């Protein structure tokens, strides 16, 4: 095997150990998490267990989205890369490494045989990691759990276009009610959950008294009440969306259900966009590219 390939694989194994660590934390605290969630459910509203299961099923069956801006980046060059890459593949990356280290408790993995491939070893003067073995594949790809089916995806701040990933990808994700780079998350590892512990999310999501309210939106959607999402849902940072962290690679179009391309916010013309959608969709024999 190629040495760079071994580097990528070791990175992915480290990421899977991160996911296993968060999942272990959630398995340890299942009872207190369920009791806090039921506490919130009985506080807001009935049969709470059934409502909690409805909310869990809604969060689990929600679509996973990755927003991009087709007017600032060439979506054709994005799709031809055959893979979506995180920010490590740049003075922003140092704060991302600190935020990820404190949020995912990466120091608890220092004894792993894959820690050399998931540790940057600090950044040099050029904002480049000192470690020659650190791999991009060890850090997650950032997405959103778009449980209200946002008009422009789950995190429209990053662009009007967005991938909708295959649902199985959600099983390799951690979830946070606030973006871990923001103030409201507070570098609190106890606010992270896995695909099998959405209850923690229900116990941790925001219930703000003005603007978009995540908790009330999830409760109303659980009761099968038809409503339009708040106009700030997914538009900002902080608590406007449920942040997801995909631990593993995202391959195009292997892991892609749909690509919602914005017609207005795009560097290509209408004719060219329709031609690309027809070409790609006919080549894949699927309705993957959707213009809107």
């Amino acid at each position: 095997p190629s040495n760079e390939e071994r580097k990528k694989v070791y990175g992915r194994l480290f990421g899977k150990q991160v996911l296993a660590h968060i999942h272990s934390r959630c398995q340890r605290d299942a009872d207190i998490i369920r009791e806090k969630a039921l506490r919130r459910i009985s506080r807001e509203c009935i049969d709470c267990a059934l409502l909690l299961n409805k909310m869990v099923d809604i969060l689990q069956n929600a679509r996973l989205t990755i927003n991009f801006n087709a007017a600032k980046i060439d979506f054709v060059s994005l799709l031809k890369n055959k893979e979506y890459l995180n920010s490590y593949a740049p003075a922003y990356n140092v704060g991302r490494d600190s935020v990820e280290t404190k949020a995912f408790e990466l120091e608890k993995l220092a004894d792993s045989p894959y820690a050399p491939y998931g540790q940057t070893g600090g950044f040099s003067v050029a904002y480049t990691p000192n470690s020659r073995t650190f791999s991009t594949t060890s850090r997650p790809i950032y997405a959103a759990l778009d449980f209200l089916n946002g008009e422009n995806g789950g995190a429209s701040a990053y662009g009007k276009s967005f991938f909708e990933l295959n649902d199985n990808v959600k099983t390799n994700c951690t979830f946070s009610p606030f973006d871990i780079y923001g103030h409201r998350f507070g570098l609190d590892t106890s606010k992270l959950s896995t695909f099998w512990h959405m209850e923690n999310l229900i116990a941790s999501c925001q219930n703000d008294f003005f603007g978009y309210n995540c908790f009330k939106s999830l409760v109303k959607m659980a009761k099968d009440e038809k409503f339009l999402a708040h106009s700030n849902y997914g538009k900002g940072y902080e608590g406007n969306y449920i942040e997801a962290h995909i631990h593993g690679d995202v391959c195009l179009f292997r892991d892609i259900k749909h690509v919602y391309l914005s017609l207005q916010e795009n560097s290509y013309s209408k004719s060219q966009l329709y031609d690309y959608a027809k070409q790609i969709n006919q080549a894949l024999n699927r309705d993957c590219i959707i213009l809107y």
Binding site: S24, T171, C173
Partner: protein
């Protein structure tokens, strides 16, 4: 290169992840709980196998049906030393083979952990899984040891011929 899509399923602790990363790296990786899944491409005999190591589709069967239509090969891994759970593996294999969207996929059974002293051979596993009672299914069973690598590339040979 030609690609073959493979879903590797089976009970937990059967040895799926060890098989995947023994084929991919040539090493025996540390036991990492498969909370969701792994997926790796293995280049063998001019074929690019895309292998999904699914931790457990027991409670998430709808989440994987999207791939079922294009799943060319199913690899069912069984712990040949786990006599207490071999019939559980039989029921799981029946549930997998009852999926209409997998009706055209070929079946490769890995009777894993043959290095253990009390492991049943490929024939006994063939009987306890009920493979001979199958109809309209192209199947094959291969005794393997994920630690050493014996049997793995033979199963990859059979899957290669079924392409």
């Amino acid at each position: 290169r030609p690609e073959m899509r493979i879903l590797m399923v089976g009970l937990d602790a059967a040895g799926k992840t060890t098989i995947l990363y023994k084929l991919k790296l040539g090493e025996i990786v540390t036991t990492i709980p498969t909370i969701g899944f792994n997926v790796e491409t293995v280049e063998y005999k001019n074929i690019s196998f895309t292998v999904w190591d699914v931790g457990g589709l027991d409670k998430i069967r709808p989440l994987w049906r999207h791939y079922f239509q294009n799943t060319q090969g199913l690899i069912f891994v069984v712990d040949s030393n786990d006599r207490e759970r071999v019939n559980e593996a039989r029921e799981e294999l029946m549930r997998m083979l009852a999926e209409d969207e997998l009706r055209d996929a070929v079946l490769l059974v890995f009777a894993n952990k043959q290095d253990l002293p009390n492991a049943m051979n490929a024939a006994e596993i063939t009987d306890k899984l009920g493979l001979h009672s199958l109809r309209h299914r192209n199947w094959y069973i291969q005794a393997t040891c994920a630690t050493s690598g014996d049997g793995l590339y033979e199963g990859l040979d059979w899957l290669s011929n079924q392409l």
